């Protein structure tokens, strides 16, 4: 309806609203965290701390998921049986890795309740991934002892990253049982992350699906489809930056080097995906913890396969854990053949043109003849120009399902993306 | 009975590089992380790194990167370190040990070979 | 890395006396230690891991004991085959660094 009418509507019809929902569904969860971080400071055994947030973990399950979290407690227990079974192996990243893909597997039979295990898949992915996780440090020898029963349990049950929290290795959790000092840096970290997660919370309900008719005198197919694709990546920025403001609240996420406490926690970069500079850092800048996972672990253990099948494997991989569908399985293939065209065509153009336009930001070590001027400028522009078309393609399908919506909503957009990426294939062949 | 045959001591032109072996026998070869240790003459032991011989992935001790690199063979079970570019204080005795399962402490330990870089 | 200080560097006593090694670690390492014994001319043997557990077929007159930044191993009733060089080190996670060592003598 009218712009004047929709202003006069939105301070007190959706965004009070919106803040209050955030507020309330997150507030016994920041509650939690606070407890165990004045708990863990307090200098009990550390035994009594990991069971402490094995309690809290119990409790934030329960009170998000009422009497379902089961699921995820025997996806707690089973892993611990899968890594007391092979504690002396050098397998068991394999071992874990194998037990959870056959778990989430019969999962997506949908025999079980299919109802809430599309709600719970959140938080099993973050225990699934920390299963997996340990069990490869320990395969390499970055992680030197397995761990106790306790130690394992309130590793995966930390209250910091039990329900949205990202993944944190499991000497990261060991750091954050061991406790820090409570500096004014530590409340920075935490009250920045939670207005942020609030204001993307706002923005992504009440500020995204109203654009272009109303905060902009542009209004389509494609105007809905960069709508669709803002709304859904601020609300992804709203659970990153959360998962980032409940996990430093509980006490994890710092990084020191040389007596120099730096709470560093990032879990999301907006400003990296909102004004891109290639589908690479866009993929990369989505979900920095779950990207690290999947590129170590997966990624450096099937390299073996090749490159290009390697990073199909990696995509298969994360459409596993994030959930089989059809929407986001045609997503993730549509990003690996994305990424891959665009990346190793800037490489050969960055190779014949002795310039920086490298998909990522090259640094002053370069063999590149040209590094500032226009002719880069201009060429990283318009891939950047390419980049948010991609993502205005991508994201179109989740608006404000199965196949045919998936076709729909592609064709409606003359599948435009697959053509450009198919000629920017071409177009690499042919200069190379 | 575990027992690591470390190969016998090698005499260096400074600048060149040397390959030191450790054959295996007594367990699977593919089933502990095997790691290389060096200690100078009487001072303290330094843990060079070590390779996981089921899948090949090395894990190096910053200070020892690019000087030791790891290879395996599984049909003979042998382990090797290469050191390239011996300065003269590379000069010392290098043991392979076995890994204790669960722990990362050196159970079973080889008997040393000992690198001498001199003219 | 972690810095392992180990004291003292020299350290003599009789046959059936006591002596006692410490180990400061200069992070917390949650009592994750292991003590190492090498004499003179062969290769280390592992004594003591999680700081506090003996191998199999380590006497029992060796005690390790501590947690956190400080460790310590205890030998009573020292025998004629317990004089050499002791090592601590850390198995928290790579890098594993050891100590400095421990040479006992007899005097």
């Known amino acids: 309806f009218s712009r004047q009418e929709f202003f006069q509507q939105l301070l007190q019809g959706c965004l009070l609203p919106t803040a209050q929902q955030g507020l309330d569904q997150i507030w016994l969860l920041l509650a939690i965290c606070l407890a165990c971080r004045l708990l863990w400071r307090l200098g009990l055994p550390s035994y009594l701390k990991h069971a402490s947030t094995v309690a809290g973990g119990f409790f934030s399950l329960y009170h998000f998921f009422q009497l379902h979290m089961v699921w995820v407690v025997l996806l707690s227990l089973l892993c611990y049986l899968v890594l007391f079974l092979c504690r002396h192996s050098s397998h068991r990243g394999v071992f874990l890795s194998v037990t959870i893909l056959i778990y989430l597997l019969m999962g997506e039979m949908h025999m079980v309740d299919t109802v809430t295990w599309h709600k719970m898949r959140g938080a099993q992915m973050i225990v699934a991934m920390k299963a997996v996780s340990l069990g490869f440090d320990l395969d390499r020898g970055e992680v030197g002892t397995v761990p106790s029963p306790v130690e394992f349990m309130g590793y995966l049950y930390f209250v910091g990253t039990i329900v949205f929290g990202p993944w944190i290795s499991f000497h990261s959790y060991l750091q954050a049982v061991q406790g820090r000092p409570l500096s004014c840096r530590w409340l920075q970290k935490v009250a920045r992350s939670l207005a942020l997660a609030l204001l993307c919370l706002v923005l992504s309900t009440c500020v995204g699906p109203y654009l272009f008719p109303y905060f902009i005198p542009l209004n389509a197919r494609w105007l809905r489809a960069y709508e669709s694709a803002v709304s859904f990546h601020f609300s992804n920025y709203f659970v990153g930056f959360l998962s980032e403001a409940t996990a430093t609240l509980a006490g994890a996420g710092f990084t020191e080097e040389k007596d120099h406490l730096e709470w560093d926690l990032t879990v999301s970069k907006p400003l990296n995906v909102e004004l891109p500079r290639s589908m690479v850092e866009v993929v990369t800048s989505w979900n920095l913890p779950m990207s690290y996972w999947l590129n170590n672990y997966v990624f450096k253990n099937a390299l073996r396969l090749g490159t290009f099948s390697a990073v199909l494997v990696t995509y298969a991989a994360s459409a596993l854990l994030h959930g089989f569908s059809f929407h986001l399985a045609a997503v993730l293939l549509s990003l690996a053949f994305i990424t891959y065209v665009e990346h190793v065509l800037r490489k050969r153009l960055a190779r014949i043109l002795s310039a920086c336009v490298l998909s990522k930001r090259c640094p002053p070590d370069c063999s590149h003849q040209h590094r500032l001027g226009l002719g880069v400028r201009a060429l990283n522009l318009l891939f950047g120009a390419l980049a948010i078309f991609h993502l205005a393609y991508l994201g179109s399908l989740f608006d404000v399902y199965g196949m045919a919506y998936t076709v729909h909503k592609w064709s409606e957009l003359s599948w435009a993306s697959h053509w450009v990426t198919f000629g920017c294939w071409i177009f690499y062949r042919l200069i190379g | 009975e575990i027992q690591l045959q470390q190969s016998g001591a090698e005499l260096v032109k400074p600048g060149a590089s040397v390959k030191m072996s450790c054959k295996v026998s007594?367990?699977?070869?593919?089933?502990?992380?095997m790691n290389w240790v060096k200690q100078s003459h009487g001072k303290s032991l330094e843990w060079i790194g070590n390779?996981?011989?089921?899948?090949?992935?090395?894990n190096y001790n910053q200070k020892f990167t690019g000087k030791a690199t790891f290879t395996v063979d599984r049909s003979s079970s042998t382990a090797y370190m290469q050191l390239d570019s011996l300065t003269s204080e590379d000069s010392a005795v290098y043991y392979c040990?076995?890994?204790?399962?669960?722990?990362?402490?050196?159970?079973?330990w080889g008997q040393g070979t000992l690198v001498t870089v001199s003219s | 890395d972690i810095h392992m200080t180990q004291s003292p560097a020299s350290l003599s006593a009789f046959v059936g006396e006591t002596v006692t090694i410490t180990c400061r670690t200069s992070?917390?390492?949650?009592?994750?230690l292991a003590w190492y014994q090498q004499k003179q001319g062969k290769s280390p043997q592992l004594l003591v891991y999680?700081?506090?557990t003996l191998t199999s077929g380590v006497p029992s007159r060796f005690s390790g004991s501590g947690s956190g930044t400080q460790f310590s191993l205890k030998i009573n009733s020292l025998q004629p085959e317990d004089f050499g060089s002791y090592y601590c080190?850390?198995?928290?996670?790579?890098?594993?660094?050891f100590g400095g060592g421990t040479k006992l003598e007899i005097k």
């Open positions: 080190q850390h198995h928290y996670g790579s890098p594993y660094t």
């Open positions: 390779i996981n011989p089921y899948y090949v992935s090395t």
């Open positions: 999680n700081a506090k």
């Open positions: 040990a076995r890994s204790y399962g669960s722990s990362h402490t050196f159970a079973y």
């Open positions: 992070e917390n390492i949650f009592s994750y």
């Open positions: 007594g367990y699977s070869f593919t089933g502990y992380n």
